[PDB]
Amino acid sequence: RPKRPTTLNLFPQVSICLSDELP
């Protein structure tokens, strides 16, 4: 069983409800 990740990087580095109200 692989270890769960602990780190996640959040920054890079590199009117009408249904299709029936229109017809």
Added chain:
Amino acid sequence: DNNFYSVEIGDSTFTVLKRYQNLKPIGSGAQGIVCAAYDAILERNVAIKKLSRPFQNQTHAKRAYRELVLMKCVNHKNIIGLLNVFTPQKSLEEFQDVYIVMELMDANLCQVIQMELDHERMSYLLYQMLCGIKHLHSAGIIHRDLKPSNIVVKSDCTLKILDFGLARTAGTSFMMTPYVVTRYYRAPEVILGMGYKENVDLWSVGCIMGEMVCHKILFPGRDYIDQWNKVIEQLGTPCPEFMKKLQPTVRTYVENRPKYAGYSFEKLFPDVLFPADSEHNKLKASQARDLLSKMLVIDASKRISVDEALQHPYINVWYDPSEAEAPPPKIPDKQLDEREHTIEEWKELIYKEVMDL
């Protein structure tokens, strides 16, 4: 004597308890602007959402009531945690604004979507997302509004679902889904105005997973007729048995569309968009694709459920009953059933919820 001070944040004025210091804005949506703050009593950061005059009209009132009631029920590590509810006004006549205080997360999922995720992180995030949904589904709550702006994450790689303003409780009666601005994640049954079960939410997880892989929205539509066309172009005209379930006029328009064939799921998500293939026998590109081809299914009766999704090998490596088989939320004797009350009555309903629990 006065326990509230009033900060200005652009247009809107936050009047909040003294314990919440150094408010700053972190996000926004239909319901206004969200602030981070330091809670001097708990000695940690929190998030603060403001609902201004939510009883002012029908659709705002239903949306606020649902939010308050369900934030009090939910209890799960992958659902945003409620911390405090208050209003600065002292009586029912004076009542204007509701303030919801929640644990603070670092970002919503739109940030993560542009970057390339390896297999471990992609599958772990979906697993957490599916665990949040199963918890809602385990009491009959259908979210109906999953989309990346409604999922938040922390840089320790945890994930939580929020925004239950569209959530629906269980029932065998048809409920029209409320209008919303970002519609790209609605399932076909919602677009076409059919009855639907809880795995409308699974279709939304399908769109989110495709986006984390494409780094692009799967079914972008200015309009509903635009959106349906993107779906059939990419997945194909659905089977004639699926056509029977439609109402006549919706049926005629859907059968009169050009019959597209749809592409393969290899053609829709080739190995190039997936990271280096793991040596782990389950975290393959071919497995993530397999899971996509079972979520992005037009006909809901053929579509995988949240529970089967958690048993899928791409996801199953992280499985823990304490997370996927956790105690349900306790849904009280209140119906979130799109009934109508007047302005005067919604005001009382919303005020009581703020003052009671």
